[PDB]
Amino acid sequence: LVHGGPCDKTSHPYQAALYTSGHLLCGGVLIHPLWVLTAAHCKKPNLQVFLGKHNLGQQESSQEQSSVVRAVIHPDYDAASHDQDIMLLRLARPAKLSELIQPLPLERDCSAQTTSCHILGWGKTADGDFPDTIQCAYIHLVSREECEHAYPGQITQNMLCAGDEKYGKDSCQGDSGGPLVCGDHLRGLVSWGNIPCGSKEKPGVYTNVCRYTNWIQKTIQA
Numbered sequence: 001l002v003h004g005g006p007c008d009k010t011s012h013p014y015q016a017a018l019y020t021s022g023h024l025l026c027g028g029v030l031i032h033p034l035w036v037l038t039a040a041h042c043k044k045p046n047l048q049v050f051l052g053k054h055n056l057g058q059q060e061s062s063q064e065q066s067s068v069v070r071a072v073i074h075p076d077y078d079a080a081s082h083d084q085d086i087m088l089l090r091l092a093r094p095a096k097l098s099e100l101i102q103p104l105p106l107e108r109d110c111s112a113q114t115t116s117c118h119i120l121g122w123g124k125t126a127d128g129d130f131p132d133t134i135q136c137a138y139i140h141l142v143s144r145e146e147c148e149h150a151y152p153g154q155i156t157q158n159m160l161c162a163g164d165e166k167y168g169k170d171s172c173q174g175d176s177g178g179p180l181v182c183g184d185h186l187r188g189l190v191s192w193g194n195i196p197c198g199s200k201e202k203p204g205v206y207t208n209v210c211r212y213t214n215w216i217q218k219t220i221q222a
């Protein structure tokens with residue numbers, strides 16, 4: 001993500017890193033000891049999920065590595081538009097919870113008031129490189145009508161927009177599936193946005209997690 005800075009070490013216990021073939025693929029969010037939420041467009045074979053990570057180059061005493069035994073994309077995911085861009089990953093071994101590994105509660109209320117949020121990830125930074133250390137930035141939800149003007153005809157009820165007019169803080173390539181956190185609840189997942197990245201005129205677009213409460217519960221419960 002661009003124009004942010006390194007997260008406080010203790011502030012992102014829910015953040016997941018997704019790898020395939022030994023390389024960073026996407027972000028993700030721990031929502032249950034057994035389940036990680038990420039973007040549908042992240043689906044690949046041989047996924048490895050890392051929890052409790054802060055710096056990707058280090059072997060951190062807090063980190064846990066797990067394979068996935070089940071990857072459940074939403075049935076109605078549309079690759080072209082990123083509509084319904086959400087996937088549940090069933091961890092092969094339950095998260096060893098600690099100070100630095102904790103699930104994040106979902107925002108189940110689509111009418112939730114809090115518009116001050118933050119995003120996190122190991123995706124591309126403003127200099128065009130990929131950071132070792134996880135980045136964080138404060139951004140704000142943008143009203144649906146604001147965002148529809150930004151991407152006329154292309155924004156569904158399954159999408160949320162968020163950005164920062166002052167610095168243009170924004171998620172970027174490699175941040176997919178990472179948490180948009182508002183009021184300390186999971187409000188969205190990094191889905192798509194402007195390229196080059198930066199939200200000064202076009203906000204980032206996020207999967208509207210509140211819409212998927214039932215589908216998540218049914219899947220975890222199956």
Ligand SMILES: COc1ccc2ccc(S(=O)(=O)N(Cc3ccsc3)[C@@H]3CCN(Cc4csc(C(=N)N)c4)C3=O)cc2c1
Pocket residue numbers: 024025026041042043170171172173174175176190191192193194195196197198203204205
């Ligand atoms: C993790 O390492 C890489 C390395 C090179 C990359 C080149 C392109 C992209 S991408 O932008 O096209 N990407 C495709 C993808 C990534 C993992 S699985 C498929 C998606 C496309 C949506 N997205 C987030 C995003 C792009 S711009 C943006 C924003 N808020 N402005 C957010 C991505 O990162 C992602 C890349 C990720």
